[PDB]
Each structure stands twice: as C-alpha cells, then as structure tokens.
Amino acid sequence: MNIFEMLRIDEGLRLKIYKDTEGYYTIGIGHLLTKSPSLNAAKSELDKAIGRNCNGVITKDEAEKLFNQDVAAAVRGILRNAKLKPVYDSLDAVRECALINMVFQMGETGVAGFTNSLRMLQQKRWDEAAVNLAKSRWYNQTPNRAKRVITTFRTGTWDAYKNL
Ligand SMILES: [Cl-]
Ligand SMILES: [Cl-]
Ligand SMILES: [Cl-]
Ligand SMILES: [Cl-]
Ligand SMILES: [Cl-]
Ligand SMILES: [Rb+]
Ligand SMILES: [Rb+]
Ligand SMILES: [Rb+]
Ligand SMILES: [Rb+]
Ligand SMILES: [Rb+]
C-alpha cells in the first residue's frame, strides 16, 4: 500500500464525467473538474486538462496522468503551506499519506483549517487527534472514508486499507 493505491480505493476510477459525493463534476480518480452546475463548463475544463477533444470521456492512461499530477501537486502544495508543512515533515511516511489524502479530497485550505487536529498530530497525540478529526463536516458527509483516513493517522498502519 502507498498513496496511489490508497486514493484509488477511496476515489475509484471512472472514465466518463460523473458527479462526486458533493454533486460536483469529476472524472478519473477523483479529479474534480469544476463546482459549476454546467456540464458544459465541466467539459471545457476537461478538454483543457487533457489537451484534446475528450466531450466528457477519457482513457485510463489519461485518468492516471491526471491522478499523478494531482498527487504530486498535493504533496508540493503541502510543502509550500505554512500550516501543513511542519505537520507533514513531523509525520512518518504512512501518516503523511493520510494528510495527502485529506488535501486531495478537501483542498489545502480546508485541511489547513483543522488547527486543533493538526496540533494534536504534530504532538503525536494520536487517539486525541483521531477523536478531534471526526468532529467535522468531512467525517459526517463521508464517514467510512474518513474512518479509514483517521485510522491511518491513529495507528500509522495500513490496517484500514489492507485488502480493499
Ligand atoms: Cl451545460
Ligand atoms: Cl488539471
Ligand atoms: Cl493520544
Ligand atoms: Cl476533541
Ligand atoms: Cl464514505
Ligand atoms: Rb470519487
Ligand atoms: Rb477530488
Ligand atoms: Rb447540471
Ligand atoms: Rb517525515
Ligand atoms: Rb482554524
């Protein structure tokens, strides 16, 4: 298990534009296209992302291309974010994956807002952090995915993903 396998479990793979858990147009492995309700706006974003005439459909290789961009950019953005960088650097490589997962799902700014949980993580107060992380819209709206991510933070193991 690694970050790619983890997010592939959590996000799935779809080759046609679809609506994510929040109702937003998405494709591939959790590649958010737009929050607009206009499918045409989503289709324009897609063509621009891939560099061709897709009208809503991509290949697996293309989906994987966007996914590695998105993971790379999540890591890079964490390391440029003054709130998230110290926490990332303080964490072991398994727990880092949980942080990348959260940023992938809810964006940098959203994760950086978990001030109290981030402090508990940097303090290595794992069960306290886990309790705090669950007190969130995040957890309420996607509780099974959040449980998996939280278990990864709490334990530093892949127990919540091994054989998914
Ligand atoms: Cl439209
Ligand atoms: Cl993009
Ligand atoms: Cl604790
Ligand atoms: Cl709490
Ligand atoms: Cl869920
Ligand atoms: Rb998804
Ligand atoms: Rb996403
Ligand atoms: Rb729509
Ligand atoms: Rb580290
Ligand atoms: Rb905050």
Technique of determination:
X-ray
Domain count, the chain: 1
Around Cβ 40, how many Cβ atoms within 10 Å?
Answer: 11
Closest CA to 25 of 7, 51, 49: 49
| Secondary structure string (H, E, C) spanning 88-126 | HHHCCHHHHHHHHHHHHHHCHHHHHCCHHHHHHHHHCCH
- Ligand nearest to the backbone CA of 41: 1
Around Cβ 16, how many Cβ atoms within 10 Å?
Answer: 10
SS3 15: strand
- Ligand nearest to the backbone CA of 70: 2
Helical segments of the chain, H only = 3-11, 39-50, 60-79, 84-90, 93-106, 108-112, 115-123, 126-133, 137-141, 143-155
* Alpha carbon of 18 to ligand 6 centroid (Å): 9
* Alpha carbon of 127 to ligand 8 centroid (Å): 41
* Alpha carbon of 53 to ligand 6 centroid (Å): 23
Edge-to-edge strands, sheet with 31-32: 14-19, 25-28, 31-32
* Ligand-binding site membership of 132 (annotated): yes
As a whole number of angstroms, the distance between CA 4 and CA 116 comes to: 27
Query: Domain with 76 in it: what CATH number?
Result: 1.10.530.40
Helices 93-106 & 143-155, crossing angle to 10 degrees?
A: 150
Do 74 and 104 contact (CB within 8 A), yes or no? yes
As a whole number of angstroms, the distance between CA 108 and CA 97 comes to: 14
Cα torsion 25, 30, 34, 39 to 10°: value is -20
Helices 39-50 & 60-79, crossing angle to 10 degrees?
A: 90
- Owning domain of residue 29: 1-164
As a whole number of angstroms, the distance between CA 130 and CA 10 comes to: 19
* Ligand-binding site membership of 67 (annotated): no
- Ligand nearest to the backbone CA of 55: 1
- Residue 11 annotated among the catalytic residues of the structure: yes
- Residue 64 annotated among the catalytic residues of the structure: no
CA angle 96, 98, 99 (to 5 degrees): 65
Burial 120-148 (b: 16+ CB within 10 A, else e): bbeeeebebbbebbeebebbeebeebbeb
Q: Which residues have CB atoms below 5 A from the ion given as ligand 5?
A: 142, 144-145
Burial 66-104 (b: 16+ CB within 10 A, else e): bbeebbeebbebbeebebbeebbeebeebbbbbbbbbbb
